[PDB]
Amino acid sequence: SMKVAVLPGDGIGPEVTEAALKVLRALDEAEGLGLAYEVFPFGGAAIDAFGEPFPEPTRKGVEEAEAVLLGSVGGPKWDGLPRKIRPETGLLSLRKSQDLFANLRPAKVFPGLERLSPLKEEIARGVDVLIVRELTGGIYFGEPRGMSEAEAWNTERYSKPEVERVARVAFEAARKRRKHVVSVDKANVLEVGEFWRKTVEEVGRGYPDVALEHQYVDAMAMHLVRSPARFDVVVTGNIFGDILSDLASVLPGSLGLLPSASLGRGTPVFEPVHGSAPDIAGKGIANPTAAILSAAMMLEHAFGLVELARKVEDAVAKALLETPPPDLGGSAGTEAFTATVLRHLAAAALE
């Protein structure tokens, strides 16, 4: 069993999600994975068809599946809509409906793509860092909150269970990688930082196979530029994670290379970081790497098929060098690039 709800969304979403499906079907056929999937309406296309971005049929399909493969969502066309039915509200409704409390965003400098990084080649080399960001609490949602003409106030607050559950997702993710977690806080100045640190240390005792270190968020802004290749997994609160994930996201030097996973109680959601790029919808040029790597994330984080996720990543790594898409200075269309990924998957299998 591998039951996937596919929500291809808007703009280039249908193209790049289909590229990811071609990869998953090739794996299913080669490995006997028991893949079953169904496509559901979501985002702008759903608004246009049904009058809302996350209609009942889709909520049901997402609930019933074991993972969501989501394309890009939204665009200029729907920007003038009431908030209640906007594509972005659909995305919040999707994530809330599943209580997804951890966002995982990996930033990887593939070998031979150091040239793309803003960092010098020797610093970019070997970067492969996974930022795990607490998604449902902290100052973004804390109470009290408000403003008057005199002042305004927001509250960074965390309860023990919120810190525990994001930490566990980080330790589990590190087991699948290089078994190293850095937890990030502001424990030398803030009570929430002290509390976060002690809670993560306590949770860490359940994961004796994973090394744990603590760093302050300001020091981490230094380290992600000076020696990012030193990290494996990094876990932190919502606002710090938003900042550091954005910092890590620019190290590979290309938006089309970045996948995202959101994990929690319900069905986990895997999607590209890039948007719907409507100006190139239907052209067959979008770089499907983010989507394909989101399917590798699905294999790894929803299904525990870590060896398979690594095979997909290696095939993508080779394809980026062999037949780079236009965003990397090459000329490979979406389908040609997907075919190159499949050739490498096939070649690695035939050992």
Added chain:
Amino acid sequence: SMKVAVLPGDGIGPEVTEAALKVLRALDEAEGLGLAYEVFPFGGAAIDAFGEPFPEPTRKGVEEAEAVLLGSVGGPKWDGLPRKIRPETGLLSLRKSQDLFANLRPAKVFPGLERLSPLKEEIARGVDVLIVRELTGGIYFGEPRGMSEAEAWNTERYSKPEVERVARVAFEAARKRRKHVVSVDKANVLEVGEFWRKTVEEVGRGYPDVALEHQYVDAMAMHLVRSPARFDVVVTGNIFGDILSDLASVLPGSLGLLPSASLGRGTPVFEPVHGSAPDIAGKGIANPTAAILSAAMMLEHAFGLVELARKVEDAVAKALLETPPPDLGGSAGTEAFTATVLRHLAAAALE
């Protein structure tokens, strides 16, 4: 009049502060600045001499002067002391005594030093950014604050006068540079961010000669790595400023190049970012660039002698290429490097 209280502090502090004084005496002699200075005990040396880091005589001298030239402070020797008399408490007492509410930290990639940056040469080229960080408020000092076994909480809060006064320091600093301020907030999610943005926009109307743009803190973590050369002045709240100033601080690739200024109601304090480096105290090798640039900051931000500050910066820029200190891969001692700075100041004057 230019009355300066010199607090040379600990470790390499006396050496590098004297290098800065040689520069200021050369300028005073060439320009007729009316420099008057006195040396006062501060930090570990004061603890050893008087039993406390910020004794009465020094508080008086700081109050009576127009600026403080402060060396590095602290070290291993005093780490086991009660908080009440630690060197770090001395520094907090110094800054509080003067109600210094804005910290200004410039990060500059001097021409021909792009090689030092972690960023590719073409991105490092031309970086000259000044981060202005609100120093006395925001979540670091906000109430309510606390922790229990169940949860912990800290409050990011700002009143209108706190935002106004740090913004004015940023607009004033931009006038002396390239007349461009980017204010940074989290206005798309947080009430404090909305409040900060509207307040800064209102203050900006008093500075029609300075351009103003707003950016979110997460976007700024992207921009300071992908296109830092695009910024001139950046102003933000305490925790965001701590994070972004640390991020900017690594772009030049050398700690010895970074000065700091703290400005507010009382006497403004100019100091290196580097610490006391006690292992090389008395060797005559410390790079005095941070201290000398802190004296340029003093000229600019305390005395408005912007042309003179730029002359000191240009002479330092040439000296770093001609006679680089050991931290830049060269072999110039502290005095030889200071002499090179003086040769360039002399040569630029004799037009």
